Design a binder for this molecule. Sequence first.
Ligand SMILES: [Ca+2]
Ligand SMILES: [Ca+2]
Ligand SMILES: [Ca+2]
Lengths: 143, 143, 143
Amino acid sequence: ELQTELYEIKHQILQTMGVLSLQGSMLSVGDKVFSTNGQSVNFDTIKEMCTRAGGNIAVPRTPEENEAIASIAKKYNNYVYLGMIEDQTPGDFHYLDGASVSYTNWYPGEPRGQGKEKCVEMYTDGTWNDRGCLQARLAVCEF
Amino acid sequence: ELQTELYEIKHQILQTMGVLSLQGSMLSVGDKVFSTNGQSVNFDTIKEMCTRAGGNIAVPRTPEENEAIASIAKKYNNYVYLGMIEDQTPGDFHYLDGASVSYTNWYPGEPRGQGKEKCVEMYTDGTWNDRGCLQARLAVCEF
Amino acid sequence: ELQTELYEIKHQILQTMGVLSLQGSMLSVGDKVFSTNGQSVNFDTIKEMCTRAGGNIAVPRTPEENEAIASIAKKYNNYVYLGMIEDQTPGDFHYLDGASVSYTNWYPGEPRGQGKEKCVEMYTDGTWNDRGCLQARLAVCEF
Ligand SMILES: [Ca+2]
Ligand SMILES: [Ca+2]
Ligand SMILES: [Ca+2]
């Protein structure tokens, strides 16, 4: 009967996640958890911070996930670098694993950096803009 | 041998709970965890905050649990709305699931709102007072 | 098939640990987690704080663990009491379980308290110094 042990384990996990959620330390959406260290740095620096914590730079794949990151962007009053970069072909973006981006939420007219804006930033309203990768942006990670 | 996997899992849970406890993010009493977002709002707002985090507005059922919530009330220097409301019959209170309240810690003379004070607040010394549900009170949740 | 349940459980644990790590609430090194409440008190007080959180006053047993505690000492700009005390024989130190200390990182010339410095403090560079147990030092716990 590890079930009773499994019940206790599940209970305690919900407790810790409950505490972190209640205190605004993270946002849970489906099986994904978003969180920020509150720091504003560039793309490469964000990537390192997220991977060091055992996670990855956040990327929304659903409207719900997009709205979650947006709320964090809104809360900290800063744009957010997302986990995707531009191919050699302008207008085409891929996740960091190489896969083609599916869900998008570009601000009207974007992307239009003409291949000179490799990264993607999220505005506080949740819409996307392709941008240079060297700006100071809120570090948001997914786990 | 999932036991060794279960040992690692139990260890990591204790670590995270240990960290949260050490930094005062929550209080553990038996199988119950209490926590606050530090905010002072009304009863309905507290209920929503707690349920959104996957928990419930706190309610003590033992002296130990009561003292835990009291310490939080004391720390934040504010009274706490508890998870119970008054029936149609004055003087009789029930938990939010409908069940009759068992453990009580009324301040001497309370409850005496004559049915016009549906909610229950905890003083910083841990004693209870029946009160209106529209005041600004420290949000404390249980998980 | 508790495996799928075990996968979910492992995932959620990594999420919570990821959040705590990302926000600097703790440092993970191997199977050990270090954390501080930011408070500066004496040896006996630290011991109580750590055990109350279900952990123990930190003690490094590897260079990696030592560097982790050092970074915390460096961050909070304060020396750290470590989990060991001196025997009746000067120069010989033991962990709190009684076992003889193995890994050491004494500052050159230390320990030289001549048996009048029972405790051990860590400098911000990570090196050790034997010291009296009544000073105000950063409380760092391991879990
Ligand atoms: Ca653009
Ligand atoms: Ca009253
Ligand atoms: Ca010395």
